[PDB]
Amino acid sequence: HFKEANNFLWPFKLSSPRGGMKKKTTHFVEGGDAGNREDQINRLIRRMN
Amino acid sequence: MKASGTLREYKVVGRCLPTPKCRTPPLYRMRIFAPNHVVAKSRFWYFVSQLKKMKKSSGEIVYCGQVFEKSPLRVKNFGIWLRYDSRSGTHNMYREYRDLTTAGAVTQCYRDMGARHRARAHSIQIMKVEEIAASKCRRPAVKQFHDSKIKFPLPHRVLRRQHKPRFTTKRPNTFF
Amino acid sequence: GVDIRHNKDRKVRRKEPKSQDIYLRLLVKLYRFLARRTNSTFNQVVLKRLFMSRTNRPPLSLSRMIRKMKLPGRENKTAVVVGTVTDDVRVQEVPKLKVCALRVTSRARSRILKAGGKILTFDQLALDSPKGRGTVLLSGPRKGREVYRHFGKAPGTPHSHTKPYVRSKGRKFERARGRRASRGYKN
Amino acid sequence: AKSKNHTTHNQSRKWHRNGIKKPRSQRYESLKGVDPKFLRNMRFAKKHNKKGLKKMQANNAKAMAARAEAIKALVVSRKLHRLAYIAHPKLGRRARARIARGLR
Amino acid sequence: VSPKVRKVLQLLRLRQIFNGTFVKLNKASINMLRIVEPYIAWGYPNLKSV
Amino acid sequence: TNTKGKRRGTRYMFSRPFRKHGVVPLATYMRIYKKGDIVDIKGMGTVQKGMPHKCYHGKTGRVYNVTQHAVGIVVNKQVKGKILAKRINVRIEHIKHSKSRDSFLKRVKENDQKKKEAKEKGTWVQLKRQPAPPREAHFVRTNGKEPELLEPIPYEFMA
RNA sequence: ACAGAAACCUCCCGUGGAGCAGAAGGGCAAAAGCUCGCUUGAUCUUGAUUUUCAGUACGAAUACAGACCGUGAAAGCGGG
RNA sequence: GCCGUCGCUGGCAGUCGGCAGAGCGAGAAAGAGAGUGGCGCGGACGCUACGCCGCGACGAGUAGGAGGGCCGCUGCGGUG
RNA sequence: UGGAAUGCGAGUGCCUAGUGGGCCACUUUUGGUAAGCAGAACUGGCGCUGCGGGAUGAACCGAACGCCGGGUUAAGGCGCC
RNA sequence: AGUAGCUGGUUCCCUCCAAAGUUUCCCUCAGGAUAGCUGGCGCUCUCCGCAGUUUUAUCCGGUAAAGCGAAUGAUUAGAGG
RNA sequence: ACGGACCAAGGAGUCUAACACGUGCGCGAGUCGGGGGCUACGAAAGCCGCCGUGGCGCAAUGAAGGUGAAGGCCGGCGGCG
RNA sequence: GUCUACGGCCAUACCACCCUGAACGCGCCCGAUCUCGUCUGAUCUCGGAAGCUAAGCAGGGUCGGGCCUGGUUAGUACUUGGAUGGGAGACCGCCUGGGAAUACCGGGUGCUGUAGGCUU
Ligand SMILES: [Mg+2]
Ligand SMILES: [Mg+2]
Ligand SMILES: [Mg+2]
Ligand SMILES: [Mg+2]
Ligand SMILES: [Mg+2]
Ligand SMILES: [Mg+2]
Ligand SMILES: [Mg+2]
Ligand SMILES: [Mg+2]
Ligand SMILES: [Mg+2]
Ligand SMILES: [Mg+2]
Ligand SMILES: [Mg+2]
Ligand SMILES: [Mg+2]
Ligand SMILES: [Mg+2]
Ligand SMILES: [Mg+2]
Ligand SMILES: [Mg+2]
Ligand SMILES: [Mg+2]
Ligand SMILES: [Mg+2]
Ligand SMILES: [Mg+2]
Ligand SMILES: [Mg+2]
Ligand SMILES: [Mg+2]
Ligand SMILES: [Mg+2]
Ligand SMILES: [Mg+2]
Ligand SMILES: [Mg+2]
Ligand SMILES: [Mg+2]
Ligand SMILES: [Mg+2]
Ligand SMILES: [Mg+2]
Ligand SMILES: [Mg+2]
Numbered sequence A: 001h002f003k004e005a006n007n008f009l010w011p012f013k014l015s016s017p018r019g020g021m022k023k024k025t026t027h028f029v030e031g032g033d034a035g036n037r038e039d040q041i042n043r044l045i046r047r048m049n
Numbered sequence B: 001m002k003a004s005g006t007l008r009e010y011k012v013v014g015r016c017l018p019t020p021k022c023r024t025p026p027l028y029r030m031r032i033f034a035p036n037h038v039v040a041k042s043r044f045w046y047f048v049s050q051l052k053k054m055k056k057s058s059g060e061i062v063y064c065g066q067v068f069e070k071s072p073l074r075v076k077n078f079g080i081w082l083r084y085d086s087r088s089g090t091h092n093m094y095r096e097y098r099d100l101t102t103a104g105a106v107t108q109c110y111r112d113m114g115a116r117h118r119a120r121a122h123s124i125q126i127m128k129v130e131e132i133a134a135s136k137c138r139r140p141a142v143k144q145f146h147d148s149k150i151k152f153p154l155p156h157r158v159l160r161r162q163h164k165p166r167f168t169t170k171r172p173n174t175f176f
Numbered sequence C: 001g002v003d004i005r006h007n008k009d010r011k012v013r014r015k016e017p018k019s020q021d022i023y024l025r026l027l028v029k030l031y032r033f034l035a036r037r038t039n040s041t042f043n044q045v046v047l048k049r050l051f052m053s054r055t056n057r058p059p060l061s062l063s064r065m066i067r068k069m070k071l072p073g074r075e076n077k078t079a080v081v082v083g084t085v086t087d088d089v090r091v092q093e094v095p096k097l098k099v100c101a102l103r104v105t106s107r108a109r110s111r112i113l114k115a116g117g118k119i120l121t122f123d124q125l126a127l128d129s130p131k132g133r134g135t136v137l138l139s140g141p142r143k144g145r146e147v148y149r150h151f152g153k154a155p156g157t158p159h160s161h162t163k164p165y166v167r168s169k170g171r172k173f174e175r176a177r178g179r180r181a182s183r184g185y186k187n
Numbered sequence D: 001a002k003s004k005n006h007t008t009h010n011q012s013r014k015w016h017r018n019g020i021k022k023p024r025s026q027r028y029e030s031l032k033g034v035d036p037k038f039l040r041n042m043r044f045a046k047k048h049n050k051k052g053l054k055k056m057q058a059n060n061a062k063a064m065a066a067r068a069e070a071i072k073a074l075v076v077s078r079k080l081h082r083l084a085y086i087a088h089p090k091l092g093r094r095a096r097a098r099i100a101r102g103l104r
Numbered sequence E: 001v002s003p004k005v006r007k008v009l010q011l012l013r014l015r016q017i018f019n020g021t022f023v024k025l026n027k028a029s030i031n032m033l034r035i036v037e038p039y040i041a042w043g044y045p046n047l048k049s050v
Numbered sequence F: 001t002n003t004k005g006k007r008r009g010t011r012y013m014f015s016r017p018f019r020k021h022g023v024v025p026l027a028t029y030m031r032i033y034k035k036g037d038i039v040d041i042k043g044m045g046t047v048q049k050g051m052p053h054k055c056y057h058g059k060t061g062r063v064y065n066v067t068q069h070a071v072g073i074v075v076n077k078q079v080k081g082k083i084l085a086k087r088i089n090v091r092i093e094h095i096k097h098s099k100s101r102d103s104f105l106k107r108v109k110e111n112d113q114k115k116k117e118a119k120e121k122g123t124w125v126q127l128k129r130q131p132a133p134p135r136e137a138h139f140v141r142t143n144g145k146e147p148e149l150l151e152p153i154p155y156e157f158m159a
Numbered sequence G: 001a002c003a004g005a006a007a008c009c010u011c012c013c014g015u016g017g018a019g020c021a022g023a024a025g026g027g028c029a030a031a032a033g034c035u036c037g038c039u040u041g042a043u044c045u046u047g048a049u050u051u052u053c054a055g056u057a058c059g060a061a062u063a064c065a066g067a068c069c070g071u072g073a074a075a076g077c078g079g080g
Numbered sequence H: 001g002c003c004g005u006c007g008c009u010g011g012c013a014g015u016c017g018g019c020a021g022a023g024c025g026a027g028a029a030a031g032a033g034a035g036u037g038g039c040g041c042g043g044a045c046g047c048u049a050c051g052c053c054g055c056g057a058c059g060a061g062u063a064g065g066a067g068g069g070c071c072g073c074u075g076c077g078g079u080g
Numbered sequence I: 001u002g003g004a005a006u007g008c009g010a011g012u013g014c015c016u017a018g019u020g021g022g023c024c025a026c027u028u029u030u031g032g033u034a035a036g037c038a039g040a041a042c043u044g045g046c047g048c049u050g051c052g053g054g055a056u057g058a059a060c061c062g063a064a065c066g067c068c069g070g071g072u073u074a075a076g077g078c079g080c081c
Numbered sequence J: 001a002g003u004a005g006c007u008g009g010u011u012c013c014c015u016c017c018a019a020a021g022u023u024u025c026c027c028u029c030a031g032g033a034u035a036g037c038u039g040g041c042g043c044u045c046u047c048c049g050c051a052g053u054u055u056u057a058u059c060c061g062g063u064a065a066a067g068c069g070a071a072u073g074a075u076u077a078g079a080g081g
Numbered sequence K: 001a002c003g004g005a006c007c008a009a010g011g012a013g014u015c016u017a018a019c020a021c022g023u024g025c026g027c028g029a030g031u032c033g034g035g036g037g038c039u040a041c042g043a044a045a046g047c048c049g050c051c052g053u054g055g056c057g058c059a060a061u062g063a064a065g066g067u068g069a070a071g072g073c074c075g076g077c078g079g080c081g
Numbered sequence L: 001g002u003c004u005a006c007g008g009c010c011a012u013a014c015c016a017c018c019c020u021g022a023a024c025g026c027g028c029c030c031g032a033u034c035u036c037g038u039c040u041g042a043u044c045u046c047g048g049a050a051g052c053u054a055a056g057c058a059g060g061g062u063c064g065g066g067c068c069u070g071g072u073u074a075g076u077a078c079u080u081g082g083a084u085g086g087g088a089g090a091c092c093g094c095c096u097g098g099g100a101a102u103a104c105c106g107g108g109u110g111c112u113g114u115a116g117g118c119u120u
């Protein structure tokens, strides 16, 4: 029941990234912010949540 | 790519996907220099895709680990085989550096192609790094340090922290 | 900012009747109470129908109430209407009926009472069966109004049996070009 | 006095402001268009479907009486499994009473 | 925002900047996180992050 | 401004493939269509009678009528704001039995089956299609030879 | 043989490189071309449908249905 | 934090008082039901129900539309 | 076992104003030597729209607006203004 | 108080929704009618359906590329008969 | 680009007929006296039904002459077969 | 094994040349009174059965042409989306995904349905 548990959660509203984005307009592999940062999502979560 | 911070020296292996035809394909090790493993796997796929008929989807990364230095307390002489593009054409190079780490010398090579040739971090393609014996080096900027009794003074010691005494009585001294 | 669209944010249902009469605004008070304080979805339908305009709650005929209360099973039930119960002069026999409507015309009170049926009101019904057990909700034909014959596909269009707006109907009032296969065409 | 000649610029957005909706898929679609001779014989089939009624019950009630001799012939851990049973408002009423009595 | 990226950022319920949601991965999901790639920064959450 | 010709812009759409000209095969005419068949349109240019208009070539629809040499089908047409249900009398040579519904049918019968069974053994089988899930964990045996080492090649101005 | 670059006869090769009234495109080989035989489906009459489209007309067109017909041993094909 | 709009087609006639017994926020469809046998005389507010109360989400705007004005002007029937 | 995933209450009916001069941008694109030129396609904008940046600015980058306090950012920046 | 498809004006607040310069026809091109987009009033149900989305099957297409020792058309050079 | 020195007062979607939809009200297969008549405000209000003539609604369709809105089972008789 | 009639997909079946075909058939062949048709019994139609696999036809062959299917070409060309990337531009690199076509080099060279024969 993942569909139902994840849909019971109102989508989280997070603050701005404390410290600040690297570059919003370019992929994470381009030294930016967008895209998939597999392991490193938690470093962003701690400074955003 | 973007040569952020100091580059790490990563050892990535990876293989194509298992199929009915090739029940097990050969593994393929590469030697990537990148800020972090997320960029190292992406340059592993850039290269493997430029060499083998193999894509990120059609394959998989078997291991992506950082390889440390075997003697980070010995000054070494690294020689690198570049491959980059200018506004008009693309050229191979060979540059030498004195450093303690291989990833250190590669960071210094990215900052050096950036300084001298204005080559952004994505045009460059390191193809071979090798620790060279001091008697095989070629660049005179690196051979000049191969002296046992080296000796030189720091002749013009420009005053830093110009603003802590910002308003002072005495004038600064540069001889030391 | 959020990227939602407020095109349909305002639901247009009737929160209350538009009339200002006080024998309806008291029924709507009693049934708004029953509607919220009971778990019977009957009162909620009666309340939602007491709001509706005079064109959305149409009249019932005595004959249509006959044939809708003669259906097997629904004997000894009270036929609830929210509009009015008009007469139907083209029916000769009338049974006994328990009825509850807002109005009953002075020639349908006669027939129903001479038959021997009861004519309740909505307050009498609310006292007889609060949750509305033993009832039969009805409503007259809504597309009966002559208005609904001009609606649909516009006339002069392949297979659009829609009535046009004409001053008078006759030989020489919209019968010439878009109707004759001879003169021009027809749809 | 030359004016712009033709465009479709805003059109693909006006189309979607009220959505692009597939038509109303109803069961029992109309029979207009079907060939005459066939749709003429289907009407003769319906017009006479009643002609075999008193014979149709003789079989529906037959296989419905036979429905009698048809059917009447065949006729994660022990801990969190016991706690999820004591904590049942109905099923655990007596395992709960057995505990309430436990402290006397 | 493009219309194809605005329909997917609203089936991911991300109707607002810095909104976040959880997403289970498969082919049909990764192929949407590829469509909306320039608008999101997604990854694999730790247990402490959840 | 273009012309409104019935066949403007069909030089390639209605042409026959390479080395597939000439007489049309007869399996085209000896296969059957019954009201409800999901049929896809592909205008063949050899036979000219009953050719579907170019705006339907490549669409799919369902049959609702059948005459001697032709059926009538109901294809959806996107018209400038909306999707009408249009009824066209396409001749038989401009039709194929679309094998799209087919796989759904061969999955329906496979479900009705696997539900008939697994009902006496009390077990529970999976009847839904699940998306290709993330691949599970495995060991990659490097039996003997270590991974070959790759490296970029120098540049060669082979122009 | 006269006969020539080119008349007419004959064998061979010939996927269409010809022809199908016209512009181009598509299609066409025991044919849709060429030559004969018989003919007038280029007739009468309902609605449906497609094309342009507003999804209105006209024009044109596709599927039938009812008659009467032509052709052919027939299956069929034909209401330009 | 405050204002407003929208939604919950939300809640409140239960102010049921010495003719009394003060409840319906709690994870689990349904009765704090009936009968049948083994001293001190006391208890805030509310409810113009077109009223009052509680919850969330939302808040740009020309042309245009709609609503609400215990906004304003002059006279008329009532009423202060 | 309501037969892929994710999301979201939908369906329908009347009456209807304004509009029917548009312009700009990435990419594709026709005429032209080209044009702040003429002409199309897709999406996003300006028009109807403030705000931070680009000294300045219809259209570029960020980001869309009830009135306020604290905190953090985007795009841009950090000798002095 | 002649007509004007033409010019200029068109009077109080707040709240809510919010465009178009596009289609077809017109002695139409400074204007209309029409479809679109908009608002208003609702109603029928909910308390299965739908989607500017992907997945999996399944058709469709003649652009980018490529080709001329493959048809059409263009076209350089030798060599062997 | 045009109007605007200043201030006061005046100043622009009105009324009638027709139509359509929505809405409130009375009666409801009926409905309505609007014309006529009878009995200070009052030129109002009330009343008439043998004043409902007539309008609209209750029947459509055809150019018209005209026609004008479920049936089924059962026996008994004649006819075909 | 294989052939005849009618076929299905219509070159893996087509084209050129060569070799072998037992038996039944399939054919060539012999005639023109009758059916029918021509300049012509060549074709067509008709009545036959002395002759023969010569040919059609079948099978096989060819460092065969073609066709079919693979590899290389090539993660190349091209390409969806992205950047306050580079360049004066022309264009180019990179991230995220998809991804071709020659030349060149390999393999294959008809499967099959119903009915009826031969191989007793
Ligand atoms: Mg800080
Ligand atoms: Mg951008
Ligand atoms: Mg907001
Ligand atoms: Mg708005
Ligand atoms: Mg215009
Ligand atoms: Mg022939
Ligand atoms: Mg016929
Ligand atoms: Mg607003
Ligand atoms: Mg104008
Ligand atoms: Mg322009
Ligand atoms: Mg201009
Ligand atoms: Mg304007
Ligand atoms: Mg706007
Ligand atoms: Mg803006
Ligand atoms: Mg500037
Ligand atoms: Mg602030
Ligand atoms: Mg500054
Ligand atoms: Mg005037
Ligand atoms: Mg609205
Ligand atoms: Mg004008
Ligand atoms: Mg003007
Ligand atoms: Mg083309
Ligand atoms: Mg090209
Ligand atoms: Mg002027
Ligand atoms: Mg002036
Ligand atoms: Mg004034
Ligand atoms: Mg009315």
Ligand SMILES: [Mg+2]
Binding pocket: none
């Ligand atoms: Mg032998």
Ligand SMILES: [Mg+2]
Binding pocket: none
């Ligand atoms: Mg002979």
Ligand SMILES: [Mg+2]
Binding pocket: L054, L055
């Ligand atoms: Mg031979």
